[PDB]
Design a protein around this motif. Structure first.
Motif, PDB file in Angstrom:
ATOM      1  N   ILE A 263     -37.785  -7.452 -52.580  1.00  0.00           N
ATOM      2  CA  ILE A 263     -36.404  -7.303 -52.280  1.00  0.00           C
ATOM      3  C   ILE A 263     -35.995  -5.936 -51.399  1.00  0.00           C
ATOM      4  CG2 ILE A 263     -34.105  -7.401 -53.364  1.00  0.00           C
ATOM      5  CD1 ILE A 263     -36.629  -8.558 -55.693  1.00  0.00           C
ATOM      6  N   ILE A 264     -35.232  -6.535 -50.426  1.00  0.00           N
ATOM      7  CA  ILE A 264     -34.527  -5.397 -49.652  1.00  0.00           C
ATOM      8  C   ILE A 264     -33.087  -5.804 -49.419  1.00  0.00           C
ATOM      9  CG2 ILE A 264     -35.215  -6.464 -47.313  1.00  0.00           C
ATOM     10  CD1 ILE A 264     -35.624  -3.587 -46.403  1.00  0.00           C
ATOM     11  N   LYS A 265     -32.375  -4.829 -49.362  1.00  0.00           N
ATOM     12  CA  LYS A 265     -30.839  -4.734 -49.372  1.00  0.00           C
ATOM     13  C   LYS A 265     -30.497  -3.888 -48.101  1.00  0.00           C
ATOM     14  CE  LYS A 265     -29.860  -6.348 -53.956  1.00  0.00           C
ATOM     15  NZ  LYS A 265     -29.184  -6.345 -55.214  1.00  0.00           N
ATOM     16  N   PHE A 266     -30.047  -4.463 -46.960  1.00  0.00           N
ATOM     17  CA  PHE A 266     -29.902  -3.606 -46.058  1.00  0.00           C
ATOM     18  C   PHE A 266     -28.584  -4.061 -45.369  1.00  0.00           C
ATOM     19  CE2 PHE A 266     -30.166  -3.243 -41.339  1.00  0.00           C
ATOM     20  CZ  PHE A 266     -30.427  -1.916 -41.139  1.00  0.00           C
TER      21      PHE A 266
ATOM     22  N   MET B  94     -29.481   1.364 -47.902  1.00  0.00           N
ATOM     23  CA  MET B  94     -30.675   0.675 -47.759  1.00  0.00           C
ATOM     24  C   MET B  94     -31.033   0.703 -49.156  1.00  0.00           C
ATOM     25  SD  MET B  94     -34.404   0.547 -45.746  1.00  0.00           S
ATOM     26  CE  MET B  94     -33.455   0.499 -43.915  1.00  0.00           C
TER      27      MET B  94
END
Ligand SMILES: [Mg+2]
Ligand SMILES: [Mg+2]
Ligand SMILES: [Mg+2]
Ligand SMILES: [Mg+2]
Ligand SMILES: [Mg+2]
Ligand SMILES: [Mg+2]
Ligand SMILES: [Mg+2]
Ligand SMILES: [Mg+2]
Ligand SMILES: [Mg+2]
Ligand SMILES: [Mg+2]
Ligand SMILES: [Mg+2]
Ligand SMILES: [Mg+2]
Ligand SMILES: [Mg+2]
Ligand SMILES: [Mg+2]
Ligand SMILES: [Mg+2]
Ligand SMILES: [Mg+2]
Ligand SMILES: [Mg+2]
Ligand SMILES: [Mg+2]
Ligand SMILES: [Mg+2]
Ligand SMILES: [Mg+2]
Ligand SMILES: [Mg+2]
Ligand SMILES: [Mg+2]
Ligand SMILES: [Mg+2]
Ligand SMILES: [Mg+2]
Ligand SMILES: [Mg+2]
Ligand SMILES: [Mg+2]
Ligand SMILES: [Mg+2]
Ligand SMILES: [Mg+2]
Ligand SMILES: [Mg+2]
Ligand SMILES: [Mg+2]
Ligand SMILES: [Mg+2]
Ligand SMILES: [Mg+2]
Ligand SMILES: [Mg+2]
Ligand SMILES: [Mg+2]
Ligand SMILES: [Mg+2]
Ligand SMILES: [Mg+2]
Ligand SMILES: [Mg+2]
Ligand SMILES: [Mg+2]
Ligand SMILES: [Mg+2]
Ligand SMILES: [Mg+2]
Ligand SMILES: [Mg+2]
Ligand SMILES: [Mg+2]
Ligand SMILES: [Mg+2]
Lengths: 103, 110, 55, 142, 117
Positions: free
Chosen positions: A74-77, A84
């Motif tokens: 999971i990445i939140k950018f 980030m």
RNA sequence: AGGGGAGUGAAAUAGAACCUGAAACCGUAUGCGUACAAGCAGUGGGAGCCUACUUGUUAGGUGACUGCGUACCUUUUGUAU
RNA sequence: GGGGCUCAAACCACACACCGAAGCUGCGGGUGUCACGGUGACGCGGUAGAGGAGCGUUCUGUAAGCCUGUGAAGGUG
């Protein structure tokens, strides 16, 4: 002979002698379990539709093993907002072997 | 088999020399020597000597007939390049690069 | 005038797809057995079975 | 237990023939587009061509309601400045009857490589006969 | 105590360039371009784990609709009849019976039709 | 000039521009895809082909077709800009 | 928005059905606070900014130790 069973918030179409992965169960490995939630059992040319559930049916399975699925990532950018985050996840499952279906 | 012959620091660009190498890749060493003897290019002059040394190597060092050989492998690599200065107008200076290359040819009777 | 973005590896290799070389038309001097250019004098001095340059 | 998907190699394709002989242009064309895409089959998958073959025989006898026979206009640009060209429903039937049905159905299909493949299974003629007696089409209503 | 960044910086670069395997052109071999592609791919993956549940539900509905009309009933009338009588089978299993077990699907549909809805 | 052998050496891909020898960049060889197709080049689904072997609910390479999808930083009330 | 639409695929009233979000429910996990002694209950978008807890690199002690030519660091899968 195939049946439809509910386990782990999902429904599975199942035939005898089948290996499948379901949601985690609180049963030790090598033990046997039963599913008293049967919605449909079909025998050859005869089909038994389940008013809520089929009355008098059961499916027996043996717990084979436990494990975790492959890692999803999971990445939140948020662009040009100086933010980030990042995370990883592996989901537990239970593998069962179906040993009997009766109408 | 598979006798080789390398020439290092050949005074030519790799791009220029790869056009000739694409003409002889896979042919017989008999019809590949005539293709290079009558070529108008300059890299064919240089590559005609590398090929004729791989043939001699396959003769003295290995005892093989010329009639059975063929150009199994040929490739051109890049080499050390010299750097010079070219004076331009209004006092500007430019970097001139004098490129070189490594030519490798292999012959095989199989 | 100059480029706004640099060209890629594939974009310049496609332009060089028309840069291959052709081979000359050779022939063999029947009387001698010497390979020469088609319609040219041999590198020895024979043309169509006639010595013309006496080395 | 994964969801069934249609393999482009083992699909079944049947042939149908439709008579456009008093049918509204736009309501005949929506049924054609459904069959061409395969939406009427339980094996439908969005990324394979699983439709059927359609044959339209009496193309020039299709009709439109209201004053659309004269006021319905078809435009196309030739690529040169001032190259907008136009033609109406009366003139196109006289000129090319098949281009009316083909244009209606073509705008009801996806605009991608698979959409152009769905469009190659439609055959439009203007006579009472078609050259596909070998394939033995079966009559389809609407 | 002077520290040199040669060993650690390279180890960090190679992690990104391994996730950028298979990308076209400079997106798989230069760090600056590959770093943005690895981040963008992660954004798409997070978003597309939600669309996967939307895309498959639409596909199942499109197949129950096609199979119910073979038996003479639309999709919206079939769901009303199933809910009214008893049946609580998913759209994932209903779509599977429509394709493979067409005899069981007909039996289910006749149960929904018999419910006057 | 530069090489192919032979010899010295534990080791010459330690050969004098000689310890190790990465990345950009340039090539050769094999496998799959690509010449009716429009766009931040990915992601979700997905056939076919090739390889390996536990012979297909498997692992690796490729990704026809299709749904969504206008880079990063900065500065700003606000940028695919 | 396009195809195309005329007892409409338009507009006006009424009725029942369905689709439709990361909303709500279901099943499985991780965390913050409070209370009782592991259970419950309420939470967990985020820029500037405040607070809390950690990873990794070089050097010193532990170390005249431990590992290592039966192969260290480094490089590449
Ligand atoms: Mg930005
Ligand atoms: Mg001057
Ligand atoms: Mg230059
Ligand atoms: Mg440009
Ligand atoms: Mg610019
Ligand atoms: Mg190339
Ligand atoms: Mg050129
Ligand atoms: Mg790729
Ligand atoms: Mg690379
Ligand atoms: Mg960098
Ligand atoms: Mg070495
Ligand atoms: Mg050494
Ligand atoms: Mg050097
Ligand atoms: Mg060295
Ligand atoms: Mg040493
Ligand atoms: Mg390198
Ligand atoms: Mg290749
Ligand atoms: Mg075309
Ligand atoms: Mg094509
Ligand atoms: Mg283009
Ligand atoms: Mg377009
Ligand atoms: Mg474009
Ligand atoms: Mg996939
Ligand atoms: Mg595979
Ligand atoms: Mg894909
Ligand atoms: Mg795509
Ligand atoms: Mg899009
Ligand atoms: Mg800036
Ligand atoms: Mg400004
Ligand atoms: Mg301003
Ligand atoms: Mg914007
Ligand atoms: Mg820009
Ligand atoms: Mg009315
Ligand atoms: Mg939802
Ligand atoms: Mg929620
Ligand atoms: Mg919960
Ligand atoms: Mg927060
Ligand atoms: Mg929240
Ligand atoms: Mg120390
Ligand atoms: Mg070793
Ligand atoms: Mg150190
Ligand atoms: Mg090592
Ligand atoms: Mg390692």
């Amino acid at each position: 002979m195939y049946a439809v069973i509910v386990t782990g918030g999902k429904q599975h179409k199942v035939t005898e002698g089948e290996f499948l992965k379901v949601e985690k169960l609180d049963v030790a490995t090598g033990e046997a379990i039963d599913f008293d939630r049967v919605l449909l059992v079909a025998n050859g040319e005869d089909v038994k539709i389940g008013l809520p559930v089929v009355e008098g049916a059961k499916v027996t399975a043996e717990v084979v093993s436990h494990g975790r699925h492959d890692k999803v990532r999971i990445i939140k950018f948020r662009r040009r907002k100086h933010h980030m985050k990042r995370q990883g996840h592996r989901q537990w499952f239970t593998e069962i072997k179906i040993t009997g279906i009766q109408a | 088999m598979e006798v080789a012959a390398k020439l290092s620091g050949a005074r030519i660009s790799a791009q220029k020399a790869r056009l000739v190498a694409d003409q002889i890749r896979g042919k017989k060493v008999g019809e590949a020597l005539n293709l290079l003897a009558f070529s108008s290019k300059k890299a064919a002059e240089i590559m005609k000597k590398v090929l004729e040394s791989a043939v001699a190597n396959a003769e003295h060092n290995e005892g093989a007939d010329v009639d059975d050989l063929k150009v199994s492998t040929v490739f051109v690599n890049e080499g050390r390049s010299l750097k010079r200065i070219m004076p331009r107008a209004k006092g500007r200076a430019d970097r001139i690069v004098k490129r070189s290359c490594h030519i490798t040819v292999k012959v095989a009777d199989k | 005038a100059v480029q706004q973005n640099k060209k890629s590896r594939s974009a310049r290799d496609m332009r060089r797809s028309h840069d291959a070389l052709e081979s000359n038309a050779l022939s063999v001097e029947k009387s001698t057995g010497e390979v020469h250019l088609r319609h040219h004098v041999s590198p020895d001095g024979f043309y169509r079975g006639r010595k013309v340059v006496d080395k | 237990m994964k969801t069934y998907t249609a393999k482009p190699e083992t699909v079944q394709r049947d042939w149908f023939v439709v008579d456009a002989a008093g049918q509204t242009l736009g309501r005949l064309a929506t049924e054609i587009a459904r069959r061409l895409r395969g939406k009427h089959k339980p094996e439908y998958t969005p990324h394979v061509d699983t439709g059927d073959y359609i044959v339209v025989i009496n193309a020039e006898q299709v009709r439109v309601t209201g004053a659309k026979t004269t006021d319905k206009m078809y435009y196309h640009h030739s690529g040169f400045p001032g190259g907008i060209k136009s033609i109406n429903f009366e003139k196109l039937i006289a000129k090319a009857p098949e281009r009316v049905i083909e244009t209606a159905v073509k705008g009801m299909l996806p605009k991608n490589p698979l959409g152009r493949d769905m469009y190659r299974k439609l055959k439009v003629y203007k006579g009472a006969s078609h050259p596909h007696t070998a394939q033995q089409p079966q009559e389809l209503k609407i | 105590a002077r520290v040199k960044r040669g060993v650690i910086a390279r180890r960090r670069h190679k992690k990104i360039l391994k996730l950028a395997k298979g990308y076209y052109g400079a997106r798989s071999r230069v760090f600056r371009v590959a770093k943005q592609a690895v981040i963008k791919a992660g954004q798409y993956a997070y978003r597309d784990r939600r669309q996967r549940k939307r895309q498959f539900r639409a596909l199942w509905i499109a197949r129950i609709n096609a199979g119910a009309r073979q038996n003479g009933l639309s999709y919206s009338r079939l769901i009303a009849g199933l809910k009214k009588a008893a049946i609580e089978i998913d759209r994932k299993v209903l779509a599977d019976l429509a394709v493979n077990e067409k005899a069981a699907f007909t039996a289910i549909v006749e149960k929904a039709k018999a419910s006057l809805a």
